[PDB]
Amino acid sequence: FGIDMNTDYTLEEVGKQFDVTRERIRQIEAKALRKLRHPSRSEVLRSFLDD
């Protein structure tokens, strides 16, 4: 997502850095996202839904 950085990087741009895996990085992102959807950390985040 390029947060704290001048630009973002796509799947292929991040693959050459760590590992060229295509579906594995996508499922890593999906796992991180679903971890962030847990109602143990997302209580504050849900308030930001209205904006």
Partner: protein, 50 residues
């Protein structure tokens, strides 16, 4: 910004091509509606309220 689209990804909601421009009652005003007068330009279809 990265944060707002990060939230978009997290929850999946997408604000469509729509912006809120509805009229609101000015603050400190409480009353009763007496008349609603609607004018429409000729050529465009008129609503059922019209």
């Amino acid at each position: 910004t990265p944060e707002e689209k990060l939230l978009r990804a997290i929850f999946g909601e997408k604000a469509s091509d729509v912006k809120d421009s509805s009229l609101r009652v000015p603050n400190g005003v409480s009353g009763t509606v007496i008349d609603v007068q609607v004018f429409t330009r000729d050529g465009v279809e008129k609503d059922k309220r019209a």
